[PDB]
Nucleic acid binder design. Structure first.
Lengths: 117, 149
RNA sequence: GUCAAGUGAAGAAGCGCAUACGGUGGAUGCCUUGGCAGUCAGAGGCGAUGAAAGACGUGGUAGCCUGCGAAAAGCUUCGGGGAGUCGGCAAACAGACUUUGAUCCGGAGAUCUCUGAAUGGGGGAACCCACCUAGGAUAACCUAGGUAUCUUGUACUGAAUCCAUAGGUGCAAGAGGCGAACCAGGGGAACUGAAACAUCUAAGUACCCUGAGGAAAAGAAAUCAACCGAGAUUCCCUUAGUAGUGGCGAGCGAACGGGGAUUAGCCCUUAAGCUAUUUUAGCGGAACGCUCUGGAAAGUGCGGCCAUAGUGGGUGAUAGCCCCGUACGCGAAAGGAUCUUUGAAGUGAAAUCAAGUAGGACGGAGCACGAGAAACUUUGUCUGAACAUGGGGGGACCAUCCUCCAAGGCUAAAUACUACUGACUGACCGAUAGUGAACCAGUACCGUGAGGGAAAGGCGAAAAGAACCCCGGAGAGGGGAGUGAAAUAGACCUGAAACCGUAUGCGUACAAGCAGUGGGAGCCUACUUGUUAGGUGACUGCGUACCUUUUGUAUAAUGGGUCAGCGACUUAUAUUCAGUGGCAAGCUUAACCGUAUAGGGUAGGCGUAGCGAAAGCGAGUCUUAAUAGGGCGU
RNA sequence: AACCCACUCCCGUUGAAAAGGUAGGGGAUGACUUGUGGAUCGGAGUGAAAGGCUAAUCAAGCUCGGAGAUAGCUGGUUCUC
RNA sequence: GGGGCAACCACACACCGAAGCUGCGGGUGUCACGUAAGUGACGCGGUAGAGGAGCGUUCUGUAAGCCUGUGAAGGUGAGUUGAGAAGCUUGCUGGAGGUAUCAGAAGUGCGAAUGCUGACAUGAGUAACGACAAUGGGUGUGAAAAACACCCACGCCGAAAGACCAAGGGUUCCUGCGCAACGUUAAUCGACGCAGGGUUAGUCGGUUCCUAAGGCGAGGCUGAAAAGCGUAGUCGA
RNA sequence: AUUAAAAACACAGCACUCUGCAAACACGAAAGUGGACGUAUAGGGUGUGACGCCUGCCCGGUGCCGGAAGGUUAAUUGAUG
RNA sequence: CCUUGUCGGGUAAGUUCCGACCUGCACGAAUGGCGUAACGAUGGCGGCGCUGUCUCCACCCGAGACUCAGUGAAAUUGAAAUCGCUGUGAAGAUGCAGUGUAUCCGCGGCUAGACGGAAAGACCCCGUGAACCUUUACUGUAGCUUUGCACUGGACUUUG
């Protein structure tokens, strides 16, 4: 029973060249280059799921820091001010209140100053 | 056919090292593990063949696929005579198991579409599991005690 | 209606990404006039009556294949059948017979140019020069035969030499050459194994010569066994990988005895010989109708019939009943072969016996057996018996017992093989596979030669293979029109990837790098109109390809131009351990028989008891003065 | 000088050429050059001897067999969890 | 490390900081549970390598079944479902075959071997276009003349770039008809395609006659077999 | 032949030695052929290399030639134990 | 060898050349020793004539290179969105870290780099690798030679 492998080879090639479209020049059309650029673009997508969490945390912090100097503190004395008391608020929703809801942020900052920390 | 000299000298040509035109890497050169003819035959046992035959002949009874008759005898070697006689028992696609396979009965059903006639020692463990209903006589139920016990 | 300052949308030479159409290219899919291996039968040869292999010639026109040979795609006869025919790659002319001998198939004959064992003498194969005899023919020829060497025989003939041998002529009979494997003899390597290598293996294998046959060889006891017996050889299965042999290394390896297949024995090339059927050609051969869709029904429906023939082929798509075929009989002018009568002769039924013989001595071979306590068969050199009151065998040798007649011959069957056929069959191939070869293949081409050796399939059901018009060189190529179910089926089924283009959208001319990933503005086209989705990606953070070798490679270490096809742990026989099964102190058969995947066949193997180098003894036994201890075993 | 040979320079090296060309050189009545036909062959020939030549191949040709020689050595070895 | 001045010692709090730990959501091995997963009950980077469990391809059984001209296999998009190999439903092209399910049998899965055979790229419209014996006008034909024919004028060989025999080649010679391919460009031209034509011997060369080197060699000697050497003889310019 | 034309190889000349003809010697399983239809003023082998002047000592080693007295020494015979 | 030994000649200046010394690491007599006229596409020095060899190049004539029309190759290539410098690093960076510079795209020239292209390095080591050569390596053999037994006899003799 001779089997000829010309039809199940083709389905596995088109499955690679579908994930690798949108690429420059010869990385999106010939297979011995488009197999390397599919594996490499899967390692980057694995590392950058962790680095996504670090690029926003560093963006939330630098927005609280700018907004809390305009009222009269730093960032680092504010976080000790909220944790002298118990307010229990993330960085994600402080940096929303810094931009959009600016009057509610000032009513938070005055309570850290009353906490005197 | 052929293929017995080095085409292009070991070193100094630029092409890869080759030694025969008739090689599995090349064009029509030769299958690298070719198959010559050989037998296919297990050897089960004498006793082991009978316990399989005795075990399919139990679930043949528990599933009511077995029709035992007094005697099955056609008279003239004519196919349309036997079609009418199987209409009495209500059966089509039958394996007929009997020990008195006669030239009236064998010349018929060499043309019937699904009806097969065998001897009691020609019955193999495929045709008792194929051929949905089996038709034995009261002589053939005796001889299973001489063969299988 | 005025300057100054700030801000920065358009604009693309060309490119990037996505989609939409094309072109190149020939893969994938489906299909086969061709292969491949088996099963069961045949028949196992052709040639001096001129072979296997060819050159040249032959057709109403023209090259090549297939047939024939100056009587040249044929001639004459018998036999079969039966209306169209003039071979294939392929048109228009010319004609032959109807109902039978025209094509067409089988038997027998006639012709049969020149080459080739080539054979009248020569040659560079397909050429030249001839004689002799009997006839015919005009200073020039044509018919018809003959004319090779060697063997055997047979006449005639007759040297040195008196006789008579050599020798020489004349006649008769035979041989010579070719062919795939098979068989018996002559001659006979090396690589490689031994982890080197000289003995040994490989191996009396490859190859090279000589014979013969459809098979050959071998065969009818101076054989083997132990005091019991077996009676020719050849072949398969066990004894057994056992006794032996072996730089006791690698390794090589019997017999006795059992089981089967097959079932004859006779005697003088030489005292005195004998050595009834099948087959090539044929013929008969049963059973179906309406209805839908479709270019076209075998398919959807709806009913009936055949059957000793229902999984065949092919007909405009899937047919037991449309066409060819499929189960049984008849044969056959004439040949062939096989069993018979039969004819001769050989096939050959058919009488003894054994002298430089047995043995011996050096030198070698074959025996499973490499001078080994080496028996036995062989024969190159040298020798040498007894007369079946003798003889020679029983693995150095010797006595006693057993068993056979050496020095002369003949033999069927079981057996081995396939260049050649014919049926059939496939868990075989499906044009990069299967023969090197589906196609005009051992061709083209490459070689002074021996020799090597490719690539090359597919329009449609049917040529219906595109009348006619317009541009063009009076062309090539197009645009219509017509055929068709369909011309993006147009001289060709499908028609992919790399590669090259043309349109449409969005981004790019102050910005540095494995070209992606995380966030992300804007724009575009669609949808309810924006997460409803898709396409582009300004800006920005992290980011030095893949494989192999290695203590480590982004590495300036290896390899890769990309695409599409193919391209690497298999088989057989022995044996060990696990998984899952059968019967169980017992389990199982190999060959071979068989109505043949059943059944028979228990020879043989493994087990149920060990210890010992062995005889031996046994739940024990060995060592030993051992009954003591100790080893192994229950 | 024809003719045979190959001492120097430059050009050529993907050449016009798998060994030439343009300029100059040596022998040129003989141990000469050459046409046709023959003889010698693979551990074997030939050789004023260099291990040179034997069909662009020579410290032992070319081709077909033994033969799928042997390689503790390089290279490669294909779908998921 | 750079701008730049955030340098050193003692000291205090606060923040920042990994795939670590915690939170929430899924998955799986192991062992128990609460029946060993009814449910619990505790772990998971990995090369050489050992163990466990699966997908797909081709052929056979089940298969005279089932699906299909209202359209099969393929090719091409799009959607959607699983931890993955992969599966499933549809738009167009295509024009006749396909294989639930579960078991067998394997020529059973390629990116890499300076792998093999066809196709197509980059180099690149780049180097070259084959002796440095020169051509310039006219007239003609034609769809179209630097290269074709004729004319006029220039150049070059002339012990050859001219004539003729021997080899060797094998119709290249000549004339009508043509220009797709070839010819290193174009071609109306051709040693190129198709169709006809065309080689005259007593004396010239062969054959016939005779021989050189050399070959073959009846009989004959020699040799395991093939065969070797050689007398008569008959071939060889 | 295709990177080396020489001081290399040749040479006329010189010496040594072997060969009395069915010659030494070579090619051949062998038959036979060359030598040579020649005959030591000839034929093989080894070295040196026209011409001129010359060529010294060593016979222990190894080889060849000469000699047999004596020692050991092969198959073949086979006493004796 | 030490060595450009020492001495004389030739040149403004001479590791080569010519003539001598002899202290010959390591000349020497047919593997010949010393001389030698004529001949060398032979080796080494010196001189006259002569010159773009050269100080140091300048100009002219042809054939290419360059532009236009026709035809149209080759080796090479993982993929490119293909800068400098100082570090690091399998240890000499277009691609890493830091920091300077640069608008996008051609054409003619030049060869510093891309450990540039071609060739599984020949030098060097290994492999219980291969060839062919040498001898006093080992085991053998062709050939040549001694003696037994054959083919192979009688007649006398010496002598055991």
């Amino acid at each position: 029973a001779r089997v000829k492998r010309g039809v199940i080879a083709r389905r596995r090639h088109k499955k690679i060249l579908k994930l690798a479209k949108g690429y420059y020049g010869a990385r999106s059309r010939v297979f011995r280059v488009a197999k390397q650029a599919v594996i490499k673009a899967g390692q980057y997508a694995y590392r950058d799921r962790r680095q996504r969490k670090r690029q926003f945390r560093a963006l939330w912090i630098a927005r609280i820091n700018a907004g809390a100097r305009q009222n009269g503190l730093s960032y680092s004395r504010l976080i000790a001010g909220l944790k002298k008391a118990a307010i229990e608020i993330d960085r994600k929703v402080l940096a929303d209140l810094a931009v959009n809801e600016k009057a509610a942020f000032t009513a938070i900052v005055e309570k850290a100053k009353a906490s005197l920390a | 056919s052929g293929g017995g000299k080095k085409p292009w000298r070991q070193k100094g040509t630029g092409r890869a090292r080759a030694g025969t035109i008739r090689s599995p890497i090349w064009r029509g050169g030769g299958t690298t593990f070719a198959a010559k003819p050989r037998s296919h035959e297990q050897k089960l046992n004498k006793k082991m063949y009978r316990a399989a035959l005795r075990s399919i002949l139990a679930e043949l009874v528990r599933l009511d696929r077995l029709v035992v008759v007094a005697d099955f005898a056609v008279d003239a070697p004519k196919t349309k005579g036997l079609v009418a006689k199987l209409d009495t028992l209500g059966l089509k696609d039958v394996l007929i198991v009997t020990d008195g396979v006669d030239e009236n009965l064998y010349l018929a059903a060499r043309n019937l579409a699904h009806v097969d006639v065998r001897d009691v020692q020609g019955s193999d463990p495929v045709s008792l599991i194929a051929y949905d209903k089996v038709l034995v006589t009261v002589s053939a139920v005796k001889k299973f005690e001489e063969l299988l016990g």
